[PDB]
């Protein structure tokens, strides 16, 4: 079963995804990075405080229909 | 309901057409477009277009014939219900 997730950049950018509950979130992240023209290393994706791993599933994370993933530009090396 | 929506012909000639559609907020991996003569014998013609596009040309049509055009959207092995329209060249 699949759920709709809303991915929202600080940007106010907004992209919706239909994701399988048991599927790794990697493709969602990389799709959003690609559509933004921004490198993966420069994004922090968050659901309820938790940074989302490429290997997290919506299921591991307690995600439901219409849940919001927030995305911030991340600076590294500090 | 369907993804995409607002499938429409936006320009045409006797033997071609330019369709356009709207994915709203959805990220789409690619679309599959089919088209065939409405109430014709032939199997449909088919082609695929990248998920970032919202426009496609259909050509090699014949003058005054009605076509049923269907667009299918896919993302990571999910397929939405398609949207169709009919258009006569």
Q: Enter the resolution in angstroms.
A: 2.2
Q: Tell me, yes or no, if B26 comes closer than 8 A to chain A by beta carbon.
A: yes
Choose, out of A3, A7, A16, A19, the residue to mutate when testing the contact with B (most B CBs < 10 Å). A16
Q: Are the CB atoms for B28 and B3 separated by under 8 Å?
A: yes
**What DSSP letter does each residue of B54-84 carry, written as one string?**
-EEEEES--TT-EEEEEEEEEETTEEPPPEE
CA dihedral B53, B54, B60, B66 (to 10 degrees): 160
Q: Where does residue A60 rank: exposed (0-12), middle (13-18), buried (19+ CB within 10 A)?
A: middle
Of 2.60.40.10, 3.40.50.10090, 2.40.30.170, 2.40.10.220, the CATH number of B1-89 is 2.60.40.10
Task: Give yes or no for a contact between B33 and B45, defined as CB atoms under 8 angstroms apart.
Answer: no
CA atoms within 13 A on the CB side of A20: 11
**C-alpha dihedral sign at B15, B63, B17, B78:** negative
Closest partner residue to A31 (CB to CB) among B25, B27, B78 is B27
- What torsion do the CA atoms of B54, B56, B62, B63 make, to the nearest 10 degrees? 50
Nearest residue in chain B measured CA to CA from A1: B78
A9: enclosing H helix or E strand: strand A2-9
Q: Cβ–Cβ of A16/B77 closer than 8 Å?
A: no
Interchain proximity A14–B25, CB inside 8 Å:
yes
Closest among B3, B24, B23 to B78, alpha carbons compared? B3
Q: Could you tell me how far CA B8 lies from the centroid of its own chain?
A: 9
Q: Is A6's CB within 8 Å of B25's CB?
A: yes
Which domains, ranges and CATH numbers included, belong to chain A? 1-78 (3.10.20.90)
């Amino acid at each position: 079963e699949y759920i709709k997730l809303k991915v929202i950049g600080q940007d106010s950018s907004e992209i919706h995804f239909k994701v399988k509950m048991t599927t790794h979130l990697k493709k969602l992240k990389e799709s959003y990075a690609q559509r933004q023209g921004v490198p993966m290393n420069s994004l922090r994706f968050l659901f309820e405080g938790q940074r989302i791993a490429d290997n997290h599933t919506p299921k591991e994370l307690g995600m439901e229909e219409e849940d919001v993933i927030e995305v911030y530009q991340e600076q590294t090396g500090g | 309901s369907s993804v995409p929506t607002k499938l429409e012909v936006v320009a045409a000639t006797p033997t071609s057409l330019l369709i356009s559609w709207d994915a709203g907020y959805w990220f789409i991996d690619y679309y599959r477009i089919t088209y065939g003569e409405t109430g014709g014998n032939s199997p449909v013609q088919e082609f695929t277009v990248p998920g970032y596009s919202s426009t496609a040309t259909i050509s090699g049509l014949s003058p005054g014939v009605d076509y049923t055009i269907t667009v299918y959207a896919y993302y990571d092995n999910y397929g939405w219900s398609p949207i169709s329209i009919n258009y006569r060249t």
